[PDB]
Design a protein around this ligand. Structure first.
Ligand SMILES: *[C@@H]1O[C@H](CO[C@@H]2O[C@@H](C)[C@@H](O)[C@@H](O)[C@@H]2O)[C@@H](O[C@@H]2O[C@H](CO)[C@@H](O)[C@H](O)[C@H]2NC(C)=O)[C@H](O)[C@H]1NC(C)=O
Lengths: 133, 211, 203
């Protein structure tokens, strides 16, 4: 049980200001294709996209020859933590943190350094992993 | 290591006033702040977590607010149950750090004591000792003069008195006066009385028994 | 439903060692990361340790004062969480809780006193009139956890701070208003695995 609104997580823990920079959009999407929470301008995902990321977690490195397709836009897979964190580099970028039951997706654009979007997204995932989510 | 500075260190207010405990950090903790309430002799309890999300069964009068390094907790219309020590903890990076803490003394209306006296037990009497205990409960303020009278005369030698924090329901203080003695001394005297006056117009509340 | 129980506290001689315990009940231990938090006897709370879940490879995080001296470990099979305290010093004397993540649910507590003295187990004498209470005399060191197990509704338990430092006495009161019941029972626990009971049956 959680009195914490998932929309409170994305607005206050994900879209907060770090070093004078913000995240473009962010969303909590489950291991089911359904999104648990999201921001306003975050893209409208599709079913095959989620399945492709989840398969990359079960077998690290199976999404790099094809690429990370979030919202139909393809991102080059700079896979970092095996089974924990998957990244992307369109030009912009994206980072995905795997929780026990969901995924934390944060889309960063210039001038946000990619490490900023990662520290922010990775901390929310660990917060949910240690809470059972 | 994000260290947190907490203030006011000691707060005193009447019932119904608005009070704010502010917590500041060495660096941005990104709304990963928790507020705890610890009544004396009890475990701490979660009022507000993640800066603004109140925990289950937390009164609406507790307010969480802030961003970056400046956070705060607001208690409007403070009630008797909101007494205690308030601590803040950040969860951005280990070391997860606390603050100093805030002792909130919630002033309330004047209550009246109920004095109870208890003869030395059968186990203590057997164990060659005897202690008449006297529980004065449900009183405010805590300024009370406890004295012990035996056979008409006053002895304050072995009197051990301990005061306690307020009670959640009515913010009522409590005291416990124990008079440690040997069984011989207790068996020698007959009348054992407990006297304490507190906002009773100098009419002492007395509780006595006979051995 | 959810409950966190600790044990293993007591009095330790300096340059000694200690292993505290935390028994989990009412939740899935494997999905929650557990912390240890210490409150000095008079001073405030401090964060001493944290261990993460299996998904995060059971990474153990320690505080600076205890970094080279303490050790945390968990057995999710038996649903327990431990803390090993080595090279005990006078400053380590504090009240220790086991805390789940942010601190949604805490434990009662167990205290460590790093002193050269010798433990003296308390003596529980019931006190009834010629409201009830329990008298706990001549124990060392603190604290004593006195809990009232009763058969009445609206039982009130007020605990009084310990009087005296070299040797300790404490009192406790149970106040029941307009309740028909007979069993009023106080259970006092001293840190090193001490359990004693007294009962006051009403006529
Ligand atoms: C008086 O009661 C205690 C505990 O009773 C419990 O209290 C209620 C809140 C409810 O949970 C009841 O169902 C419980 O029974 C008794 O103490 C326990 O007694 C059992 C067996 O009698 C023993 O196995 C336990 O170890 C005891 N635990 C403790 C902490 O004492 C006690 O027996 C009762 N006394 C009388 C005279 O009835």
């Amino acid at each position: 049980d959680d009195k914490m609104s998932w929309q409170a997580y994305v607005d206050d823990h994900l879209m907060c200001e770090i070093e004078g920079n913000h995240l473009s959009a962010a969303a909590i999407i489950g291991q089911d294709g359904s999104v648990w929470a999201q921001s306003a301008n975050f893209p409208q995902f599709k079913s095959e996209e989620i399945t492709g990321i989840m398969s990359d977690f079960h077998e690290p490195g199976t999404l790099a020859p094809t690429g990370l397709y979030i919202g139909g836009t393809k991102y080059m897979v700079i896979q970092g933590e095996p089974g924990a964190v998957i990244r992307g580099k369109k030009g912009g970028g994206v980072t995905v943190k795997k929780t026990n039951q969901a995924l934390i997706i944060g889309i960063y654009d210039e001038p946000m350094t990619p490490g900023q979007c990662n520290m922010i997204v990775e901390r929310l995932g660990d917060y949910l992993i240690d809470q059972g989510y | 290591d994000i260290q947190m500075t907490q203030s006011p260190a000691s707060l005193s207010a009447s019932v119904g006033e608005t009070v704010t405990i502010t917590c500041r950090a060495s660096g941005n903790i990104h709304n990963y702040l928790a507020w705890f309430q610890q009544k004396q002799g009890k475990s701490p309890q979660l009022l507000v977590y993640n800066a603004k999300t109140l925990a289950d069964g937390v009164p609406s009068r507790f307010s969480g607010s802030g961003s970056g390094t400046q956070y705060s907790l607001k208690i409007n219309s403070l009630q008797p149950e909101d007494f205690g020590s308030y601590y803040c903890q950040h969860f951005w990076s280990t070391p997860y750090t606390f603050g100093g803490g805030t002792k909130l003394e919630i002033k309330r209306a004047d209550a009246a004591p109920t004095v109870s006296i208890f003869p030395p037990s059968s186990e203590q009497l057997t164990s060659g000792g005897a202690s008449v205990v006297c529980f004065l409960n449900n009183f405010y303020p805590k300024d009370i003069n406890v004295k012990w009278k035996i056979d008409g005369s006053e002895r304050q030698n072995g009197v051990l008195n301990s005061w306690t924090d307020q009670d959640s329901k009515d913010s009522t203080y409590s005291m416990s006066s124990t008079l440690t003695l040997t069984k011989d001394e207790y068996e020698r005297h007959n009348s054992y009385t407990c006297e304490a006056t507190h906002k009773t117009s100098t009419s002492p509340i007395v509780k006595s028994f006979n051995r | 439903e959810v409950q966190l129980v600790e044990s293993g506290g007591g009095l330790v001689q300096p340059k000694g060692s200690l292993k505290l315990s935390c028994a989990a009940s009412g939740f899935t231990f494997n999905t929650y990361a557990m912390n240890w938090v210490r409150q000095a006897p008079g001073k405030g709370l401090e964060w001493v340790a944290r261990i993460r879940t299996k998904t995060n490879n059971y990474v153990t995080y320690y505080a600076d004062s205890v970094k080279d001296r303490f050790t945390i470990s968990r057995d999710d099979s038996q649903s327990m969480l431990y803390l090993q305290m080595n090279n005990l010093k006078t400053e380590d004397t504090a009240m220790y809780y086991c805390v789940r993540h942010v601190g949604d649910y805490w434990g009662q507590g167990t205290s460590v006193t790093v002193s050269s003295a010798s433990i003296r187990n308390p003596q529980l004498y019931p006190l009834k009139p010629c409201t009830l209470g329990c008298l706990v005399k001549d124990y060392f060191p603190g604290p004593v956890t006195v809990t009232w197990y009763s058969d009445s509704l609206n039982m009130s338990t007020v605990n009084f701070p310990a009087l005296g430092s070299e040797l300790k006495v404490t009192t406790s009161q149970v106040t029941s208003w307009g309740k028909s019941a007979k069993n009023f029972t106080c259970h006092v626990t001293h840190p090193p695995s001490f359990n004693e009971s007294r009962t006051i049956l009403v006529r």
